[PDB]
Symmetry: D2
């Protein structure tokens, strides 16, 4: 029994709302610090307290932004989009308001480097919906907030993209940016490419979801910012773009016939963020020839329902819990807390395609593994050299 | 749920279902007369020169551990006894100049690959499959392996094929190629990219060839090199630990429904995707948070999902081109019927005896099966070695 | 042949000849007024914004060790105190916003390079050249160094300039850029290719830039990071031994006639090609088969062949574009008069006191001078660290 | 001086080096008469390998000169005399009855010097290979094929077996495809930049880029090209890397005609200039480096090293050292036969006497110009 693309879209909307609205509405009401849980594996909240809310806000907005970039209309979904966008804009104003209880932390610890970069990515996926409407004083505060990060740093790995993307955003805004951060993060990430659509997360190859969590989406987004200033070439952007496209094939292929996907590597608590590269490629209308938009929609539909339709991944008040499919704090990394979990929005990027795009209107289609395992047509795969 | 005893009888049944047509036909000298030469295009020229050694080498590499067990009086023991005798008969025929089943070693580059799988069979069961051969046949295999040195293939995992063969000749006390051993070992080490993965040649390739070739053969080669001082104990341990780490990903990619993703080239090798998991389990080197029982139960579900029904077999019981079903469109141009017998390579845990904890411990869910129903989920993390 | 004492007086004369015009004009506020701005193209636009910091930073980085010596009233002691007082005066001028010799830190990427050489002077003579500065002047240099963070240059040895500058700021207890230190340290370590050589950026460059920048500044940077646990003692030892190794080649390339090859880019930097040799010598870390006296004597010959005559000097005592002579055809487009004061960087041994054995041991032929006469030639061999 | 006088100096010095090896081999008295000097004084082990070292290393350097057509000049008479003695010694060297039968089967070392012998055959095929009788030809093919049971270091040694197999490929006999494929790919991977390879996994600042890597990579690739074991771009790449490398070697000749002693195997002496001599012979010098200044720089080197007797023993054999008797700088693997690398800087004698390399007016080399205030071409590392 299949669903239609229009039914699938409605499901995604319900599920994305279920994930993100607690974060967005509390931020808008100024009650995010007050109400969000701070669940950690250890149970300690010290330290986590200073960073988890920027984690929730940046990671949530990074995933809902394409949806909120769509032009307004009077349809039912269009009303939901308008409402969430208004609450987001209200929370974004609070988040840098010194009188707001939800003033977010940018000045302390290395962690905000990460989450500022996901916030920046939201601004890049929806400039006209989420950045341009901000009043000038709010805009200037975000500029200074991003510039204040430069006295700290994180690991020698995918973290280079966080500070690289942030500076590339500042460059795109015509404000003062750090050329060193832009240059070394680009070249380093290029040196870390190991083949067949995969980078190493730092000097050693890591078989995990971090290529989807950080590397492809942000390498591409950063290079796009750098092209007009000639800080990167079209060749470099096409290169990173095609490596993301290739990576998305493996990620669509690892969705099983039952709609599950393997749990592997660190930060498994990010759940369907493991599909951000497939979600980004779908949003950009760049799926490879043999991988239909419908089959990606349907594959990610099954995964979305498998992980967010029931309440196994949510607490009594609708917040995400530590775990994978269930309350499983034993798989949370020591650096993870409740706000970290909002990477979960990053598979919902194709809601930034309009409701009349083929991704949402083509008929249901089995995905690769589902075809493979019932004897259907199974396209030949092969590693690439670019 | 089935018991571990029942699981073993299923693996026996399905490993027999796969391997017996190759083994019995070679035993009877009718493998050339009887084995299909299915290709995606349908052409059989060229393929016909190489496909029968593919079937034999790949089949034997996978059944060799089972056939290595000590004999006993059980019903399974009789099956082992019967199969081993037919293998020994086929191996004599395979290098007999007057047998219609004489195998090709001199034409094409492809024999380099499948001689290495046969060598791997000899290495997994030396007392059972090599030593009982008569000396004339042993000498013929020695010369057959040495005659491979005029050709070569791709600059990738293929280097392990010739390194492993040469490490076998070394281990046998006959003349071997030191250059093949020195460069193959060093290049494979240079291709390690991290977290249990090698690049299949200069460029990383997200596929099953780390399982098909690289881990098992690098470990097995270093095992031959070590007593002869062509590798150090630390080099062996390093390759061993890298294979063990790799088997973690492979156990984790078995889904709750017993399936696993179809990705990368040579997907027609089916469950050979699990040779590194199977090699680690046979070696009883599974990390402490991955129970022997969950590996048994995971691979049982995969084995039944791929081999219990007949979707992957033709009317005569031979493997067909595909993944789960008749899917010729996913077969590489280099693949034929004989190539498909990689399918044996997930059955190495039959090389543990019936009373090993792998086969007696109670049923256990595997990693994703637990993860997806809210059960306990061990935290994973990339390693640095 | 000369004695050590006559060699020291020669080096003092020649270092003074090179450096005094820069230092004395800076002290007098007349550096911008009097220093030529000679370029291959003949253009001064752009170059005039940067060429004076180049002059100052490069001159100071090379005279710093000598000025670090304790004071005494010998004829040389008088010269050291005269020059030090004029450096201290010029350094105040260089950041005084009303001084005519105010230096540029904010325009172009080039200040990143020459601020680093000025930092290196401060690192080589902290009690002589940094501590005596007034607090306003100190804070100005701190702010100047931090204002560089909006620019960058080439993806090569330049990473050490910003890495070393930030390591100085860290050592001064002020706000420093951690990202700059982390990636510069790791990238430069990644560019080590072997036998005492780094690649200048991603592709190996057979030129003098290992001496111009990489060894001396890697070591000095790790020295600053060590007490703050931003580098290990193992990392510093590695860099130190790599520089020691590198100096062996540089001492071996001085010919029996006291010349050395002209090769690679920025050949106009003249004896700065021997900075790693000079640095290892000053640190009293020459390998056992290379005596201090043979380094003194080889570098004395080079120093006299390059600086005693006036072939490399214009009518006013400034350095000219060239190698040994007026040779603007070999000057890079990025080079001007100020750039040439890299020539000080081989006089680091003057930072060893006048009774150090480098300056008192009997004359000794250097490696190639012995080799080409039939004398003892120590066996060389590439190293694995 | 004139290039014609220089050329006569090179002929005389090349003969001074090589004629002891060649003449004794043609007489069958090489084993009897050649010393086996070592730093330790031991001769065991060395005695099994050092003679092929002298023959292979000598012939690799004299081969271009002996490829020249015969003519009635005085120099022509010397070439035909030397060539005929080489052909005689070559027959002897694989004659199972000859006292100068060379070892190919014992130790790893013959892998090296068979490659140098192969390089002599590649450098002068019509003069030193074709005239050999068929049975002697057969014996060499077998001797080269018998090397496949042994190997040496994981470094420049790969080129020895690669070049040898490419020779067998070129002769249409049975060859090792694996040796050709891996040696080609490994050496490409060891290229670090600016005309230098690492000698194995770790970069080594020494003369082995000139000793082995450039000339043998290029020669091997030329054999592979027509058989589709290498492409034209691959050959062009290795050629341009050799050409770039010769610039540094030409620049390290000092104004006094010396050059720095550095790195291992320094006892090979002017073989440090094989890549320069090879590019000169190939007439591929970069446009700012005149053939004449190369001729003249190497004449100063060749005289500083070979005109006097500081590098020879009482019987005209090379002795261990650099410039003088300096056995303290010889590696433990080096013996008397090893020293005949010294021929490898003489390749441009393979240009005829009327080539511009030998008739262009005297010119100062790069450092001689630079140090007297002459013109100095701007150098810059390359990216290919």
């Amino acid at each position: 029994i299949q669903t239609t693309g229009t039914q699938d879209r409605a499901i995604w909307v319900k599920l994305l709302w279920k994930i993100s609205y607690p974060v967005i509405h509390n931020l808008a009401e100024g009650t995010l610090h007050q109400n969000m849980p701070i669940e950690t594996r250890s149970g300690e909240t010290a330290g986590y307290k200073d960073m988890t809310h920027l984690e929730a806000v940046g990671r949530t907005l990074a995933g809902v932004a394409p949806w909120l970039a769509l032009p307004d209309d009077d349809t039912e979904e269009g009303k939901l989009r308008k409402q969430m966008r208004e609450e987001v804009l209200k929370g974004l104003k609070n988040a840098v308001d010194p009188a707001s209880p939800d003033l977010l932390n940018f000045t302390k610890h290395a962690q905000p480097i990460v989450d500022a970069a996901y916030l920046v990515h939201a601004f890049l996926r929806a400039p006209k919906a989420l950045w341009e409407p901000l009043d000038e004083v709010t805009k200037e505060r975000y500029i200074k907030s991003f510039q204040s990060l430069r006295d700290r740093t994180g690991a020698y790995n995918n973290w280079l993209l966080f500070t690289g993307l942030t500076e590339s955003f500042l460059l795109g805004k015509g404000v003062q940016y750090d050329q060193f951060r832009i240059r070394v993060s680009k070249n380093k990430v290029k040196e870390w490419y190991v083949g067949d659509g995969w980078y190493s997360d730092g000097p050693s190859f890591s078989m995990d979801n971090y290529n989807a969590y950080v590397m492809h989406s942000m390498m591409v987004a950063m290079l796009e910012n750098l092209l007009p200033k000639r800080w990167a070439s079209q060749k470099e952007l096409d290169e990173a773009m095609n490596r993301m496209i290739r990576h998305s094939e493996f990620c669509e292929r690892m969705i099983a016939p039952d709609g599950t996907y393997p749990a592997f590597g660190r930060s498994v608590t990010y759940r369907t963020a493991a599909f951000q590269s497939l979600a980004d490629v779908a949003l950009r209308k760049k799926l490879p020839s043999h991988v239909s938009p419908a089959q990606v929609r349907c594959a990610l539909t099954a995964v979305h329902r498998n992980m967010y339709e029931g309440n196994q991944n949510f607490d009594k008040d609708g917040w995400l819990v530590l775990g994978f499919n269930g309350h499983q704090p034993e798989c949370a990394d020591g650096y993870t807390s409740t706000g970290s979990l909002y990477m979960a929005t990053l598979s919902f990027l194709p809601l930034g395609l309009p409701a009349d795009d083929p991704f949402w209107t083509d008929a249901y289609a089995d995905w690769t593994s589902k075809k493979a395992w019932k004897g259907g047509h199974l396209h030949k795969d092969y590693k690439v050299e670019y």
